[PDB]
Amino acid sequence: MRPEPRLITILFSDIVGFTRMSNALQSQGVAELLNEYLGEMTRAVFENQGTVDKFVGDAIMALYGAPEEMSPSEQVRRAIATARQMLVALEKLNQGWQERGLVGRNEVPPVRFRCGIHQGMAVVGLFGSQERSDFTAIGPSVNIAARLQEATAPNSIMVSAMVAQYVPDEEIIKREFLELKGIDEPVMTCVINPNM
Amino acid sequence: SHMRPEPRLITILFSDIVGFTRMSNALQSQGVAELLNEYLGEMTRAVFENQGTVDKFVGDAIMALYGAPEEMSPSEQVRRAIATARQMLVALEKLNQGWQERGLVGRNEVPPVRFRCGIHQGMAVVGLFGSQERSDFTAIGPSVNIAARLQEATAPNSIMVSAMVAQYVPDEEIIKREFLELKGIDEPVMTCVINPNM
Ligand SMILES: Nc1ncnc2c1ncn2[C@@H]1O[C@H](COP(=O)(O)CP(=O)(O)OP(=O)(O)O)[C@@H](O)[C@H]1O
Ligand SMILES: Nc1ncnc2c1ncn2[C@@H]1O[C@H](COP(=O)(O)CP(=O)(O)OP(=O)(O)O)[C@@H](O)[C@H]1O
Ligand SMILES: [Ca+2]
Ligand SMILES: [Ca+2]
Known part of the structure; x- marks a missing residue:
């Protein structure tokens, strides 16, 4: 547990459109919706032996390579697999929230997903x-x-x-240098295929 | 730790510092651990002394709650949240003074650490x-x-x-009043910068 320097893989995921969607329902409903979502994410992280660091509202932070040791290649393989399994879950959830009137139906679009992964x-x-x-x-x-x-x-x-160096070339959909706050050297980012 | 989600009027406090990464770079690890801890220790004590609840840490950011899990009047929530925010800022200044005296700040010149706090009740x-x-x-x-x-x-x-x-804070303690348009919210919000001193 004692803090130490280690090579790990960090995964941040977040959804946009949650509050908008929940704006209709009462407290009980907002909680059910969120718990439903949070449970699915957790499941995706655990099934891929990842560590759920924390929840930040409807955002999720997971770690690979800590506390339990894990090779750099497995860290990435599992981080990627988690991100992809999360997307499938959101598809399933959004399907259910649409057939249930929380989406598509009159001004609360389905909930979009964003995931970032880095190793260092x-x-x-x-x-x-x-x-x-x-x-x-x-x-x-x-x-x-x-x-x-x-x-x-x-x-x-x-x-x-x-x-990305551990990801098959054919899976990298788009490459682009991005200027990230606090970082001088532009960072080469790669959007990967959400399937496989 | 057993409370099922329920609607409730509470006061939320978010604080965040800028300069930790920069200060910890010209440094080396179990020294960034003790540093953040030193900072986190001061912040949490300010929340605990004011009977606030430390919800979580988001990096070097702090989230505190007033009115949960333990019930608290809407006025007490504000008094304690305000007091917490003011004590944190005082502690930060004390910390920067110490770090300045250790070459952790104001050398290889990483500016002193800056503090930001936002409070809302609803x-x-x-x-x-x-x-x-x-x-x-x-x-x-x-x-x-x-x-x-x-x-x-x-x-x-x-x-x-x-x-x-602001409705619970003495009018003379309100440094500035101004309307700002916050993200994802339809009606502009009336913001009020409070005096760091009582
Ligand atoms: N329970 C919680 N714990 C910590 N931070 C929280 C939180 N609930 C909300 N926040 C913070 O509140 C802010 C919410 O603003 P945004 O993240 O921009 C909304 P969004 O993700 O774009 O749409 P969404 O709320 O519909 O998902 C963030 O800064 C988030 O970190
Ligand atoms: N341990 C942790 N847990 C959760 N989120 C973390 C985290 N460490 C960093 N982050 C996230 O990483 C990002 C850091 O970016 P910023 O908050 O803009 C840095 P800053 O506050 O401007 O300067 P600073 O790092 O010197 O304090 C934020 O999105 C923060 O929430
Ligand atoms: Ca979100
Ligand atoms: Ca910060």
């Missing part, structure tokens, strides 16, 4: 204090993964060069 | 969110989004609250 060094371990301490990762690598998730287009998966 | 679905496999206690809803947007909109080393919060 990060101080990982327990951070906080006596009042509160949580297991997480800190550092530019984490910052980068978060910025990729926010920079990518709707319903897509964007990764860094460090991650 | 309805929110509070309780445990997630699934049987994983769930945490937090608040959800437009009210939470607002508090977050207020913190990201205010200027460095300042505290910005919404009208709902």
